[PDB]
Amino acid sequence: VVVVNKQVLLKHFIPGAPKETDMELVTTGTIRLRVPEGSNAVLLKNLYLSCDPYMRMRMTKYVDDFVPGAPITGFGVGKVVDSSHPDFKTGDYVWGLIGWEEYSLITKPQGLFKIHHTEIPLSYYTGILGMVGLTAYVGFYDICSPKKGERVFVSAAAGAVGQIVGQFAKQFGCYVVGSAGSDEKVNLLKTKFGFDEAFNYKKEPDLTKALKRYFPEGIDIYFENVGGPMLEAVLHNMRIKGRIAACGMEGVHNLFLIVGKRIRLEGFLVFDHYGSYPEFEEKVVQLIKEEKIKYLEDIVEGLENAPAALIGLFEGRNVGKQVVVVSR
């Protein structure tokens, strides 16, 4: 039994900006609808794919590089078509690292997360109930060591992770301000996403002065997605014993302030915190069913459009988390 398996490949490594033509759709590839006789594997029918900003790095030659001539890979959601592994069976829904294709043979099924809540749209497990949401959870609740009433700044706040960090922070009793690159997004953070305040970093000539304006008594917590001058502007406006969770990130000349302000600047990677996933799924499903958290998805239909969607996200032309629908 053989079926068409369209794929989106990385055409080649790149050094500036990315283009639709750095990827290619191939439609002359096939797949058996069975896992190899003798492996403990699972074959997935892929439903949804996430476009996440860290995927830019994988296109240039210390995470795992993409491979030229092979399917682009990334987080997504699938249905189990066939499984010779004890922990999965036909019809189970899962999320994990999958190919940019219609079908993925998962050789190591233990890298998959079981979706227990098939009653909440499955595309959620590409973001808020996925890697993105789990990033925000561990970055805020763990790395920031927050306390009620503290003063929180989120850069790229309009992005998928930032929006979630801000709502966890508002829910925690913090004062919350956020940064974005367009008026449409600054307004949504206030009107959709519960942020106390928000500005367009591009309307502002002096980021230090801007942050002063929103934080008269200074900043306790910075959720960092950006770096550079924005970081310098935070350090100038940071309070004693403040905390910076470095989730993502030219030059910073401001660091000596870390000494006199007793600042903790710590990087993390969501990949170390998979053990926190079951707790996280429980909390966030509950918030969503309680209608206490808000979430917008940018939905693009068809693999054929995935390259454009990814480049769209890279440029910041998305509004809320960017999702590709492969099928059903």
Add this chain to the structure above:
Amino acid sequence: VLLKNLYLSCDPGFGVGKVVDTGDYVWGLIGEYSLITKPQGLFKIHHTEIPLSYYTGILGMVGLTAYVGFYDICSPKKGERVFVSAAAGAVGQIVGQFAKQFGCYVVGSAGSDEKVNLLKTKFGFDEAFNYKKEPDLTKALKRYFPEGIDIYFENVGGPMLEAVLHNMRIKGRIAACGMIKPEGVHNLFLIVGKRIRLEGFLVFDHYGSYPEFEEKVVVGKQVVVVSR
């Protein structure tokens, strides 16, 4: 307290005195004699058997800075790989010896051969180099740390910090004790993929840790004297 002042330190003041109005020896922030309105700034010197002068440095603020910065902020473990900038300075020298005593591999940085060669003899450093006869600090640190750096005791900043970040291991730790528009660091994103903790501290928050500290093992740490 009216104190008769015995010893003065020089950092960038601290000293040791005797209580006149008694016989208690103390250390703390002092100015011949000093009137003290607020005396919580004065600590007792609970071992008059050790020479008292040492309470301007190694049994004083300097030593306490090294202690809390290394034992607390760096979270060290035996066998880890430690780099100390300004190693020849009063704090650095002490950090390095706490680290060697803790079982760590220890390398240090200084600005003159007299001090470098001093660090690699008297003060027990495994390695030491002179930052000014080194075109490429990144390459230099690589030379002394083939398997990379777990811990950086930071006194300097700038390009040295960039050089440490390039050479730092996963989950490494930087205790920011001091930093000399300053020079930029262009390297910080490495903090993300390496899961590095970069934390500043000020000894002034840690006066409570002093009793603990005092109970310890048993061109110089320079004490200017005043009396007998």
